[PDB]
Design a protein around this nucleic acid. Structure first.
Lengths: 90, 365, 150
RNA sequence: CCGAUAGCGAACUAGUACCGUGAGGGAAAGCUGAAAAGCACCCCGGGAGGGGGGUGAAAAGAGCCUGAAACCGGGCGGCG
RNA sequence: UAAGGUCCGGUGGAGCCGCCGGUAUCGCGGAUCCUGCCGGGAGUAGCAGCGUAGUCGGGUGAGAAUCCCGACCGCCGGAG
RNA sequence: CCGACACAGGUGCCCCUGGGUGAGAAGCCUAAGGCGUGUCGGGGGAAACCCGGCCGAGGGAACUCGGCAAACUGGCCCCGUAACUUCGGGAGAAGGGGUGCCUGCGGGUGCGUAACCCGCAGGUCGCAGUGACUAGGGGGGCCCGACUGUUUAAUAAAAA
RNA sequence: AAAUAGGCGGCCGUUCCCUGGCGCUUGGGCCUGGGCGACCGGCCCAUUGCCAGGGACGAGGGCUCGGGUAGAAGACCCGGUUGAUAGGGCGGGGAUGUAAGCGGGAAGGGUCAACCGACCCGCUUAGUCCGCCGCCCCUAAUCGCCCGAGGUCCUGCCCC
């Protein structure tokens, strides 16, 4: 798939008991980052400060069970990648 | 020393406690022959249930209602790939030769819409292809050269000892593997020629719970138990607790041994593998055989099983099944093989087709 | 200096590194592993190490370090720092060789050997009033690459 | 007579650095080359780092005369 | 016999032997020796325990988890 | 600063009246103000084992030199309070009850409806109303020493 | 890894050319004198074989990716589009116990009016949630790397 856009829901559930609970929130973010990258078949991605806020909202300890995210695919120049994805909350 | 004795904790009789050599169970020990009938059969553990039966099962009443926990197991049908021949040597039993069957039917197989390329699965046993055992390379030719090799063995005549069967699974509804697990089962009779005739008919045949085994018998079960990982001295062997309140100690063996002797014995408790060990547990009552599940049109000898919502950690049960009494060694989704009993109790008689008052229909969750 | 034979006019190109602030032991595992390859394979090998993809097997020094899957010896680890640093040595043999009239990519790596150089030494605290050496090893690594082609 | 782990505490930045509240205690640290020509010019390198060319001779290239042993890499022979 | 002598090759680039008579701060394997240098230990332990803190965009730079800006999430509250 | 160390140490004052809380310079939360350099990161849902800590049926010290450790009680209000006695005390004995929110009143001090505080009745929810944090387990015999204090600064705080 | 170092079934590797030199070197059949025979001598054949110079092809397996019935690392097991492995969506099965809003009632108090109200009921067997199962290929199981040979150095059994 090429051109825009997928709306995806990423299951956060790995975050509990893969790492501990305060520091679920740094972990959630690595999961959001992986899920999107995986699905995209892409580099690490840039994700909007809005996803952060969403994960973070309750605090470090309590991140939410799902998070709905909108991703796009785009190219670049100079030499390099396909491989760049801009994703934000929906 | 108080001069007080402590009986040993743990056994060295199910020792050494270390990983299985294969996911398939192994076998050396075969039960009594007395009939020209299939020995040993296989399944996948589905889950567990509990059952109400009428005694039957001789014990402390022979007519009141009795609770018996039950393991529901989905058995696949099996397909005898080949006939393995043995010759008796000087040093032990060695395999003379084999007939295999390269030859290809199309498998009772289903799967799959999308749809444009159904892309045919029509199974020469593409499940053999997925089985990592290899194949000639001229199907007809190979089978016949082997069959001729068999004819020789039958002729000579007493050079040949007994017959066992290389038998493999057929995954035709199970989603937890798609690659034949391959095993050996013996074919017993009482004399070689009768086993030779039966194995030859058998080879092209998709077979049942019914063929192998009968309700109301007691059966052994052979299996690789569920893997815990490494566990403590506490867990593996059993350890007792100590004095007034110990922070420091608690889960501890103290002594490994004296000063001279200047060695460590192997019988002292330590950490290491627990589980993923092979076990044969004797004398489990065959509660039931049927096929489906979920609905059956007759109301006695089951009315048909399966909790709604499946079971936790098991797919849909729809194929031939067996419900066996009590505990079955292994994990959910593991291959278990069933072994007839070598001898069952004798102070407690087997009684055929035990009376099944009621079956569970609630989920394990 | 250099610790191997030369025929630099048309069959050898050389370069050396001095006082690279790197582990000598991790230089031992890369030099051995890398040895005998052509330059291009050696670039490729180093790039994989940095990605954290292909492990460098531990061999001669090997104790108390976790194994790594696949063909090659049981333990192994990834020396990222050394891989970056050695990549620069190799790059220098490559630019030089071209002035010299050798084509670098074809030339095979005969010899790579590591030398434990001077020792940066001091003190960091331990208990009971005592201070103990806290040292960084500074390492020289030489590379002499040689033509082979038909 | 000794000759730089020796001989004066100390061949020198010594009664220094440093220790100790103080009284007092107290080291180590010598050698380019004929000439500084103490590294221009040229190639490379993020590079104050490092490599090639440039000196009668650089195992004379900056605590630079010689340059051992322990010990460390590589290579050769042999064993494995 | 030997304590030790002597010759060749490489290295080194200014001093050195023999004989005879003398003389001694005169020969080193040990001294929980003294000092100096070095390896294994290890690429291990520590870089955890006390009220457990960071994180996303962006700026800069050869190199950025720990530099800076904003946002977001916290601790502290006679004390961080 | 001093402890060789940018040491969890420990050295004087002052801000001791920030807001909420509640007897409080208490805890927690939170404001001005400060910081995220009590300066190494990441990974394995992380298995054994070890430290801090949470929960355990039934039984209720069977453990052990010893209930050590730990638990329990718990704030506050009311009731009630033994042996003994140097009549001062014991005593907060012991044991029993209550405590939330709302709605509506009364009293005290004042001035006129402020600022607080102390009671009373009704309605009503939860397993639990000091729901958190804060927060004594109790009782009896005996030995010693009157007490409070001091002691081997750093294995003995005691009867010395 | 039992050194008497196993047994079976399948899969694999299982090569060329010019030019020069050699061939009872390598291999077979026949005649006759000698030999039991191998062998000597005579006759017949080789697209062949050998040395020197250059030269092909690549079975298995890991690494890889999605997860675990597995697990300290490593290993193990399964699936990888010849597919339902993981996630989404939906639906099935489970956990909790009535959501937000609104509407009515509600101790009372008030010009008993606009209303202030803890709480109760209806909406609503609601709402919220799942480490499980099915449907379903939408999304992600891509992309790509490697190591590992070359009927075997020499001998004997049967043919060549």
């Amino acid at each position: 798939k090429a051109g825009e856009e997928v709306i995806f829901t990423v299951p956060i559930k790995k975050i509990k008991k893969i790492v501990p609970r305060w520091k679920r929130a740094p972990r959630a973010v690595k999961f959001v980052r992986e899920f999107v990258a995986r699905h995209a078949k892409a580099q690490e991605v840039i994700i909007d400060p809005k996803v952060n806020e969403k994960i973070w909202e309750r605090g470090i300890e309590k991140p939410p069970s799902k998070l709905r995210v909108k991703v796009k695919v785009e190219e670049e120049k100079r030499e390099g990648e396909e491989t760049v994805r801009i994703a934000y909350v929906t | 020393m108080g001069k007080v004795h402590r009986p040993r904790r743990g056994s060295l009789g199910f020792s050494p406690r270390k990983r299985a050599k294969s996911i398939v169970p192994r076998i050396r020990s075969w039960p009594k022959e007395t009939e020209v009938r299939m020995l040993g059969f296989a399944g996948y553990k589905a889950g567990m249930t509990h059952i109400l039966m009428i005694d039957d099962e001789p014990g402390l009443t022979n007519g009141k209602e009795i609770f018996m926990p039950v393991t529901i197991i989905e058995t696949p049908p099996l397909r005898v790939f080949g006939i393995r021949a043995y010759r008796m040597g000087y040093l032990g039993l060695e395999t003379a030769t084999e007939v295999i069957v390269p030859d290809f039917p199309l498998d009772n197989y289903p799967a799959k819409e999308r749809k444009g390329k159904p892309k045919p699965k029509m199974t020469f046993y593409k499940l053999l292809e997925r089985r990592i055992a290899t194949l000639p390379k001229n199907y007809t030719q190979e089978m016949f050269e082997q069959k001729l090799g068999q004819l020789e063995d039958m002729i000579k005549e007493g050079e040949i000892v007994d017959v066992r069967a290389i038998v493999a699974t057929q995954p035709w509804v199970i989603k937890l593997k798609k690659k034949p697990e391959v095993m050996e089962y013996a074919i017993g009779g009482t004399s070689v020629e009768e086993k030779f005739n039966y194995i030859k008919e058998k080879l092209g045949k998709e077979l049942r719970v019914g063929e192998v085994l009968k309700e109301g018998e007691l059966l052994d079960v052979i299996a690789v138990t569920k893997g815990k990982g490494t566990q403590g001295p506490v867990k593996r062997w059993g350890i007792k607790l100590r004095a007034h309140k110990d922070s420091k100690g608690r889960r501890k063996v103290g002594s490994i041994g004296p000063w001279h002797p200047a060695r460590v014995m192997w019988t002292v408790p330590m950490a290491g593998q627990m589980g993923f060990h092979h076990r044969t547990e004797l004398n489990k009552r065959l509660i039931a055989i049927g096929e489906n599940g979920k609905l059956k049109l007759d109301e006695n000898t089951e009315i048909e099983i399966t909790p709604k919502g499946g079971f936790p950690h098991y797919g849909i049960v729809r194929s031939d099944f067996m419900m066996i009494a009590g505990s079955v060694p292994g994990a959910i989704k593991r291959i278990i093989r069933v072994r007839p009993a070598i001898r069952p109790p004798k102070k407690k008689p087997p009684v055929q087709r035990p009376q099944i008052t009621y079956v569970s229909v609630e989920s394990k969750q | 200096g250099y610790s191997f034979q030369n025929f630099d006019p048309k069959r050898m190109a050389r370069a050396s590194a001095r006082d690279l602030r790197i582990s000598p032991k991790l230089a031992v595992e890369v030099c051995r592993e890398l040895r005998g390859m052509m330059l291009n394979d050696a670039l490729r090998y180093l790039d994989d190490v940095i990605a954290l993809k292909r492990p460098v097997p531990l061999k001669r020094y090997n104790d108390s370090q976790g194994h790594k899957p696949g063909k090659g010896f049981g333990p192994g680890r990834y020396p990222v720092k050394v891989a970056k640093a050695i990549k620069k040595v190799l790059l220098n043999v490559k630019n030089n060789a071209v002035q010299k009239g050798l084509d670098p990519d074809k030339l095979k790596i005969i010899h790579i050997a590591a030398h434990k150089g001077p020792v940066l030494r001091g003190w960091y605290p331990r208990a009971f009033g005592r201070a103990t050496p806290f040292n960084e090893q500074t390492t020289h690594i030489e590379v002499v690459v040689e033509e082979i082609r038909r």
